[PDB]
Amino acid sequence: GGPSVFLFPPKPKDTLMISRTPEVTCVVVDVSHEDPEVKFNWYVDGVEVHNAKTKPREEQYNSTYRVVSVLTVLHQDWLNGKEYKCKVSNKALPAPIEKTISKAKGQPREPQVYTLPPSRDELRFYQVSLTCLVKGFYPSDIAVEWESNGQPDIFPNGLNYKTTPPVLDSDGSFFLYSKLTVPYPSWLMGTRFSCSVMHEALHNHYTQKSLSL
Amino acid sequence: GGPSVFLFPPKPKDTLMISRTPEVTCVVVDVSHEDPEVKFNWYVDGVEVHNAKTKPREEQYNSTYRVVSVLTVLHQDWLNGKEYKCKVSNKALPAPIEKTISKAKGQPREPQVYTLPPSRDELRFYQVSLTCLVKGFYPSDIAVEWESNGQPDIFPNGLNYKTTPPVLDSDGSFFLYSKLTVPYPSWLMGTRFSCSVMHEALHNHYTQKSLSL
Numbered sequence A, B: 001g002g003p004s005v006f007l008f009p010p011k012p013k014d015t016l017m018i019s020r021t022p023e024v025t026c027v028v029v030d031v032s033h034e035d036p037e038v039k040f041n042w043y044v045d046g047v048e049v050h051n052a053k054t055k056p057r058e059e060q061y062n063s064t065y066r067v068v069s070v071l072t073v074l075h076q077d078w079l080n081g082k083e084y085k086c087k088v089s090n091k092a093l094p095a096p097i098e099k100t101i102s103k104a105k106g107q108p109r110e111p112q113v114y115t116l117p118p119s120r121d122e123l124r125f126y127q128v129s130l131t132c133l134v135k136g137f138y139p140s141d142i143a144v145e146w147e148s149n150g151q152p153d154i155f156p157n158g159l160n161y162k163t164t165p166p167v168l169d170s171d172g173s174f175f176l177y178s179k180l181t182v183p184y185p186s187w188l189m190g191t192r193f194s195c196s197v198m199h200e201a202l203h204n205h206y207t208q209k210s211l212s213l
């Protein structure tokens, strides 16, 4: 064939925070040197739009260019299920490649957030684990972060945490876990930690759950 | 080209338990009706073997057969890093397709297992969540299960649990979480639950961590 197209959704956090701005990204790979001509046509539910923006092309070590087309979207357009289509055309293609992406369908469901202290057996070590359980949400688009009331003297570098991907639960909903690693002295001195979750189905798209000794 | 080949590693649990038998699986898709002839040649570190077994072909909705070749492997052969090669040949191919798979390289690291009781705020609900943290292991091949001392009268159907995929941690090791959902009355009556973890770097490839009220 010829070039390949891939269309990605906006960041879950971008569509949920008022401060941020979501965008859809249409990437084009496998584009030839002989015909590096690429065009884009964007359609929101079958209605063309021309506010998208194409970034400069870039060569890769595999001797192929890379074209990307970014389309900023309204917060509530995506959350209401509007479908976004990217139409790519180039000489190397017999017919243009059209791709579409939208939010997962299904009545959203609200997550429950639970913080669990570190296991008693983990204090033998110096780094202990604070856990945040987020369960029962749909769709799986979600954002998770940790906060502290600890000054930089205890945390000169920021907080160290990692979050699992969403896992389909036995009731059609999703769950995940996020682990925050902190020194034991910080846990013992009464530091207040906070698990923050952004999800469509939450009121104000946000909830925050605390954890401390 | 023609048909496509895919080679899969043995289940982590299969290579760790003596009772089970691990297998490398070499799948062939996109095989034509005009030429449904397939051959396999297996090599363990460049040494041919003839104990593999081919299962009957199966028709697909897209009108393509699918041929599978299964090779049982010795437990310690895989765990010691031996590379397994699958060579596929068919009329529709100009030259045979060879694929190889082996265990991830790197000094193995032993996991730590910690059980966390359900959050106090989750008792509002009837289904509560028991958590098992497994962290600090390498490679990411691991198997996790839950056990109970509860008869079938409390659990006529088995235990309900889901386990996350491994997540790369900030020290090059991996962690995961497994969630067991149980009715609150079972938690309150003293039922003893058990998180069982099978990993190469564990002594006897097995460890078990308990949890109860």
Ligand SMILES: *[C@@H]1O[C@H](CO)[C@@H](O[C@@H]2O[C@H](CO)[C@@H](O[C@@H]3O[C@H](CO[C@H]4O[C@H](CO)[C@@H](O)[C@H](O)[C@@H]4O[C@@H]4O[C@H](CO)[C@@H](O)[C@H](O)[C@H]4NC(C)=O)[C@@H](O)[C@H](O[C@H]4O[C@H](CO)[C@@H](O)[C@H](O)[C@@H]4O)[C@@H]3O)[C@H](O)[C@H]2NC(C)=O)[C@H](O)[C@H]1NC(C)=O
Residues within 6 Å of the ligand: B004, B006, B008, B009, B011, B025, B027, B029, B030, B060, B061, B062, B064, B066
């Ligand atoms: C006619 O219909 C067929 C069936 O629908 C089509 O077959 C499919 O063909 C595609 C390629 O076009 C293959 O894609 C690959 O999938 C691999 C994963 O396969 C496992 O998981 C899927 C479900 O997720 C499952 O259906 C497979 O059968 C396979 O299951 C595994 O099976 C083994 C033993 O059989 C078992 O031990 C495992 O536990 C089990 N695992 C699971 C999760 O069930 C990928 O690994 C491949 O990835 C490659 O390519 C990626 C990018 O393309 C790259 O990132 C990767 O690194 C890697 O290189 C690849 O995506 C499907 O597997 C195959 N499905 C089946 C059932 O055969 C057929 O293509 C279609 N005809 C045509 C013309 O399209």
Ligand SMILES: *[C@@H]1O[C@H](CO)[C@@H](O[C@@H]2O[C@H](CO)[C@@H](O[C@@H]3O[C@H](CO[C@H]4O[C@H](CO)[C@@H](O)[C@H](O)[C@@H]4O)[C@@H](O)[C@H](O[C@H]4O[C@H](CO)[C@@H](O)[C@H](O)[C@@H]4O)[C@@H]3O)[C@H](O)[C@H]2NC(C)=O)[C@H](O)[C@H]1NC(C)=O
Residues within 6 Å of the ligand: A004, A006, A008, A027, A028, A029, A030, A031, A060, A061, A062, A064, A066
């Ligand atoms: C020249 O070199 C560049 C970089 O090495 C290659 O760019 C990649 O090309 C492959 C072509 O297959 C693309 O593969 C697709 O990747 C997607 C992942 O997107 C994430 O990752 C990229 C980079 O890591 C991020 O930029 C992006 O924001 C995302 O975070 C997958 O989603 C795709 O999977 C889907 O399609 C395949 C094929 O149908 C299915 O098998 C999957 O199941 C799934 O449906 C796919 O794997 C890759 O995206 C390209 N990266 C970038 C950054 O563009 C060029 O391909 C290479 N040139 C040639 C000719 O290959």
